[PDB]
Amino acid sequence: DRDAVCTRSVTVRLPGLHNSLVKLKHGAGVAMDGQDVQLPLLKGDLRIQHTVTASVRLSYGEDLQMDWDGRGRLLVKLSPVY
Amino acid sequence: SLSCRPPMVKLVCPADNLRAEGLECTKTCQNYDLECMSMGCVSGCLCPPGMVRHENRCVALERCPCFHQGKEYAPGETVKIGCNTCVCQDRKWNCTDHVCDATCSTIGMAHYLTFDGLKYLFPGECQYVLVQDYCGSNPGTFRILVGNKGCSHPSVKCKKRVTILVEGGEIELFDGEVNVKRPMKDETHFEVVESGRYIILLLGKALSVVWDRHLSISVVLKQTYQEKVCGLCGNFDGIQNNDLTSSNLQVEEDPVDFGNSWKVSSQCADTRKVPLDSSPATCHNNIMKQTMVDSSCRILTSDVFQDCNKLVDPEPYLDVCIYDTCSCESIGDCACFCDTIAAYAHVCAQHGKVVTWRTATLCPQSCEERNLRENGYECEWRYNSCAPACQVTCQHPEPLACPVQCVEGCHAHCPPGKILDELLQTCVDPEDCPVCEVAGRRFASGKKVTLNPSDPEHCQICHCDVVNLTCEACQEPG
Ligand SMILES: *[C@@H]1O[C@H](CO)[C@@H](O)[C@H](O)[C@H]1NC(C)=O
Ligand SMILES: [Ca+2]
Ligand SMILES: [Ca+2]
Numbered sequence: 401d402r403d404a405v406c407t408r409s410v411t412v413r414l415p416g417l418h419n420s421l422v423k424l425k426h427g428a429g430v431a432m433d434g435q436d437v438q439l440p441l442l443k444g445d446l447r448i449q450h451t452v453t454a455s456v457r458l459s460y461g462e463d464l465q466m467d468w469d470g471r472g473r474l475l476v477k478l479s480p481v482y
Numbered sequence: 483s484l485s486c487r488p489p490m491v492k493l494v495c496p497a498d499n500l501r502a503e504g505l506e507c508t509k510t511c512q513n514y515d516l517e518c519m520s521m522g523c524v525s526g527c528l529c530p531p532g533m534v535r536h537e538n539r540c541v542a543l544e545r546c547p548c549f550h551q552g553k554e555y556a557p558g559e560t561v562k563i564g565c566n567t568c569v570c571q572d573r574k575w576n577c578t579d580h581v582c583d584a585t586c587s588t589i590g591m592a593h594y595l596t597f598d599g600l601k602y603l604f605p606g607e608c609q610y611v612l613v614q615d616y617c618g619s620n621p622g623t624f625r626i627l628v629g630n631k632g633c634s635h636p637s638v639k640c641k642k643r644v645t646i647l648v649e650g651g652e653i654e655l656f657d658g659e660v661n662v663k664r665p666m667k668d669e670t671h672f673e674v675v676e677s678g679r680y681i682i683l684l685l686g687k688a689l690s691v692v693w694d695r696h697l698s699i700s701v702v703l704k705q706t707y708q709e710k711v712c713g714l715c716g717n718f719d720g721i722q723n724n725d726l727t728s729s730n731l732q733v734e735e736d737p738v739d740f741g742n743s744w745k746v747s748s749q750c751a752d753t754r755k756v757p758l759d760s761s762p763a764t765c766h767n768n769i770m771k772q773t774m775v776d777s778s779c780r781i782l783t784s785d786v787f788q789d790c791n792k793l794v795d796p797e798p799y800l801d802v803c804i805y806d807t808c809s810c811e812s813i814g815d816c817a818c819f820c821d822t823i824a825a826y827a828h829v830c831a832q833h834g835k836v837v838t839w840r841t842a843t844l845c846p847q848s849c850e851e852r853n854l855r856e857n858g859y860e861c862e863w864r865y866n867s868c869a870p871a872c873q874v875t876c877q878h879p880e881p882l883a884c885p886v887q888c889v890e891g892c893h894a895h896c897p898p899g900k901i902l903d904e905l906l907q908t909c910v911d912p913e914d915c916p917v918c919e920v921a922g923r924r925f926a927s928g929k930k931v932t933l934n935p936s937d938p939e940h941c942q943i944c945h946c947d948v949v950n951l952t953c954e955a956c957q958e959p960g
Contacts, residue, residue, distance in 0.1 A: 411519055421519065434521075 407472035414460060417445060424469040428456050486527030489540050495523040504528060510535045511546040511573070548575055551792055581705050583885065586613060586715040588628070588699045589799060589825045590806040591636035591818070596716040596725040597703070601798045602737040603805075605634040608750040609643075610714060610741055613701060617712040618731075624648040624689060626701060627746065628714075634753060635763065636809045636818060642697055648685050655681070658695055669931050673882055676904065677871040678891025690885040696821060702885045714744055765808035772808070778819070779803035782826055786839050790830035799826040820845035824890060828868075831888055836868040849892035852907055862896040862909060869893045876903035876915030879927050918946030920953065 412422040423431045430437050430448055439456070441448040446460040455468035465477035486492055495502040504523025511534055529540040536546050547554045548570030550561060560569045568577035584597035592605035609629035616622025625647040633640030645654040651666025660674065660681060675682040683691040688704035703711070709719040716725030726734050728743035742752040765772040781787075782796040782803065803822045810818035823845075827837050840847055852863040869891075872884035879901070894902050900909040918928035921944060928946035941956035 413517070413519075 407469060407474060410469045410474055412458065412466070414446065417443065422446075422448075422458065424456060424458075424466070424474075426470060428454065428468060428470050430456060487540075489533075489542075490527050490529045492525075492527045493523055508535060511541075512549075514573070544573065546573070548573060550575070581708070581720075583702055583704055584718055586699065586701045587825065588642075588697060590802045590822050591630075591633050591640045591697060591810075593802050593805075594714050595798075596714075596722075597718040598716060598720060598722040598725055600716065600722060600725045601801070602726075602740075604714070604737050604741040604753075605636075605756075606630060606741055606745070606753050607632065607634050608745045608747055608752075611744045611746065612699065613711055613713040613715045615707075615711055617710070617717075620710055624685070626691070626713075628699060636806045637811055638813070638815060638818070640697070642699070644693070644699060646685070646691065648689070655693065669929075673878070675871060675878065675882065677873065678866075678869065678889045678893055680871065680886070680889045680891065682871050682886060682889075684883060684885075687883075690883075692886060694821070694824075696817065698821070698825060714741055762805055762808040764811070765804075775804055775807055779807075779822075781823060781839065781844075784839075786837060787826075787830070790826075790833070790835045790837065793833050793835065794826070794829055796826065799823075799829075816845065828890065831868040832886070834887075836888065838867045840865075840867075847892075852892060852894075855907055860896075860908060862894045863892050863907075864895055865891070866893040866895070874901060876901060876910070876917070876927060879915065879917060880925070916948035918949065920944040920946050920951055 408426050410424045412424070414420050414422070421433055425431060428450070430439070430441070432441075437448070439449050446458060448456060448458050451457045451468075455470070456466070457468075458464070458466035463479040463481050465475070467473060467475035493504045495504065501520075502523040503518065503520045505526030505528055506520045506522075506524060507518035508526075508528065509518075514534060529535060532544075533540055533542045534544070534546065535541075545557055547556055548559075549555070555561065555570060557571070558569060560567050561575070562568075563577075565582040566578040566580055568575050570576065585595075586597060587595040589595060589601070593601060593603060595601050607630060609627060612626050612628040614622070614625040614627075616625065627645045627647070629643040629645070630640055631643070633642075641656060643654065643656040645652065649666035649668055649671075650664075651662075652664035653660065653662045653666070655661065660683070666672065671684065671686045673684040675684075679694055681691075681693040681695060683693065685691065688706035690702040692698070692700040692702070701715070703718060707718055709717050711718050712727065717727065724733060726737065726740050728734050728740055730743060734740050734743075736755070738753060738755050745752070759766070761767075761772060765775065779800055782800050783791060787796070799822065802825075803819065806822055807819045812818055823839065827839060830837055847865055849863045849865045853859055853861050867890065868888035870884075871886045871889040872882050874881065894907075894909055896909040899911065901912050901915060902909045903915065916927055918925070928948055930945075930947075932943060932945070934941060934943060938956075938959065942953070943956055944953035946952065
């Protein structure tokens with residue numbers, strides 16, 4: 401159908417760290433700057449880990465969360481500082 | 483290959499810089515302020531840094547237009563949204579800050595559109611506070627109320643009753659006419675303009691009411707209040723998701739528990755939480771009829787409304803159409819359908835889009851009976867699509883504060899040199915008006931008001947009933 405437009409991927413960009421570029425892929429996969437990565441990924445600020453072992457969760461600082469973009473159910477949590 | 487055009491120059495990915503933002507991040511006028519992803523450039527030919535692409539033309543200056551409704555606007559051009567003008571100076575629209583005049587409504591039997599804009603469903607059968615000012619920590623000037631009977635299920639039943647309580651008064655209306663049970667003190671602000679299909683009704687500097695003689699209640703307020711009111715229409719603050727603050731000072735999520743907080747009689751019946759569904763009672767398990775109603779409510783999305791659909795979203799006014807005329811058992815009067823579309827056409831008229839949607843096989847609205855009392859058929863009354871509501875008459879010769887630009891209905895039109903009076907149904911020459919001009923100055927046609935209360939020594943009163951050039955003597959206090 402033409403009335404069926406789902407989300408495939410989402411791209412996150414953190415100018416605070418390297419001006420990097422995270423990418424949540426159509427699976428539960430993540431790819432920083434082209435490089436696939438094993439979870440967890442404790443860098444300084446951002447943590448990426450599974451939740452139920454079937455869904456990724458980004459957490460930059462204490463003012464940002466995310467959720468799985470595998471089959472297209474992205475979420476965000478923005479704290480009142482924004 | 484193709485040597486690209488003169489106005490732009492080709493790029494090459496350097497092997498060192500990862501930031502090869504070249505062909506992939508082609509900056510057009512949309513995506514300049516927006517930030518772009520890029521892996522590496524391509525073997526394309528991109529405009530210089532000082533200019534951008536614009537519909538197969540690398541427009542040089544940063545003068546490219548400012549889009550709205552998917553339409554071009556050159557820099558300097560203006561747009562009129564609401565009561566504000568707005569001109570995209572550089573590349574962003576630059577609007578004024580004159581807040582406009584809000585408007586409740588009662589679209590159909592059981593729906594309500596707040597000031598800030600929130601349609602919700604509330605079928606009730608008691609009397610309810612539509613809007614008031616005595617809210618928390620305020621004086622409490624006006625207390626417009628509304629009251630319905632047999633109106634939980636829309637039908638040819640559900641006549642509304644409206645009791646408005648301003649300046650210690652009690653003027654109320656039902657069954658077509660308006661009735662004064664208690665006249666109010668400052669009669670100067672009072673006014674009634676029975677023009678067309680409506681009863682326009684002013685009450686002050688910053689209050690007005692409209693009534694289509696059948697169900698609709700469109701109270702209009704000015705900039706004066708700005709979070710001084712509350713009721714079923716909300717608080718008039720701009721915030722659009724706090725219009726469910728009940729009387730007990732908390733936001734609720736279910737509107738059927740909201741309006742139950744605003745009933746006057748605290749011992750009548752509170753309405754029942756209906757199980758939610760896309761099909762009302764008649765359209766429940768009658769999927770045949772459910773399509774004949776859906777199609778007929780697509781007049782709201784038709785060739786004649788295409789101009790307004792770009793300004794006013796019809797999706798709110800369509801949900802009301804399917805809801806009302808399912809529940810309504812329309813037999814002789816197809817008014818539970820013809821009144822939900824007129825409510826959309828009038829909103830389209832306020833934004834300057836007059837519409838003629840009404841034909842002989844759909845909601846006819848004749849106007850021939852007013853041209854009957856005279857044996858000679860002069861034929862001045864006509865159905866006019868949207869005519870001005872605030873004109874000059876023998877009863878209201880001066881121009882009034884006009885909250886409504888134009889209105890539907892039967893309008894009397896005759897050649898100039900004649901002015902309309904309502905008692906004698908036809909239009910008549912100006913001299914036949916009972917007009918008053920005492921001691922020279924221009925004013926109304928002899929309003930029944932006692933001017934000059936302020937100063938005793940300057941108590942020089944001059945009434946005028948219809949024509950008399952008289953002045954009355956003041957009774958001294960001593
Ligand atoms: C908007 O217009 C005002 C008044 O002319 C001007 O001061 C201001 O710079 C303009 N702002 C933009 C974004 O164009
Ligand atoms: Ca509000
Ligand atoms: Ca105009």
